[PDB]
Symmetry: C2
């Protein structure tokens, strides 16, 4: 049934898209701090594609994660380890989700999918 | 530079191939505990395809990671969290790796890559 796919071209990799639809977690695989200012994260469930734009001064430090929770998730924001998506609630479950991460230029530096079949 | 790849058709997925060359970590993303008896990890470096056959009754519980430590790594076994690979030592650095998980039937349930390009 469940099927996962992933890719990366650098330090940051998308680690998990929650099956219950409450968070998206990224991680810095490298040992070098990655400035993520101006980066973008586009989550596409079918037709809709919602984009989270990182703050101008964000730095995902080495070997550490960032968990973008939804507003309805019930988890408060404690940056930098945890952040909250502004004005976007849970995306839901059962639908194919694909999350694309884009740098400041606009290239795709990472991806992750969760295609459901039956 | 460094690239990444991943695939999964079930609960168990491969989470990291050590760049230094000391461990291969998996995880049971789903809530279902997975019976992992007789499964095999074919770590394909270049031509060689060394493989680790699992115990008869090992089970990866929900949201639980297993790390197949090398012999020369220096970490003692502490099952079920960590396990050791018999007489395999280090993969090395700068080597393109591919670790393929195999179920008891012989099918592939996971995949990971770490293609290094200067």
């Amino acid at each position: 049934s469940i099927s996962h796919s992933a890719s990366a071209t650098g330090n940051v990799c998308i680690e998990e898209i929650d099956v219950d639809g409450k968070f998206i977690r990224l991680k810095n695989t490298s040992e070098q701090d990655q400035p993520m200012g101006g980066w973008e994260m586009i989550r596409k469930i079918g037709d809709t594609s919602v984009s989270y734009k990182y703050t101008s001064r964000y730095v995902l430090k080495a070997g550490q994660t960032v968990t973008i929770w939804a507003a309805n998730a019930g988890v408060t924001a404690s940056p930098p380890t945890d952040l909250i998506w502004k004005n976007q609630n849970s995306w839901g479950t059962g639908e194919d989700v694909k999350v694309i991460l884009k740098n400041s230029q606009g290239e795709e530096v990472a991806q992750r999918s969760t295609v459901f079949k039956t």
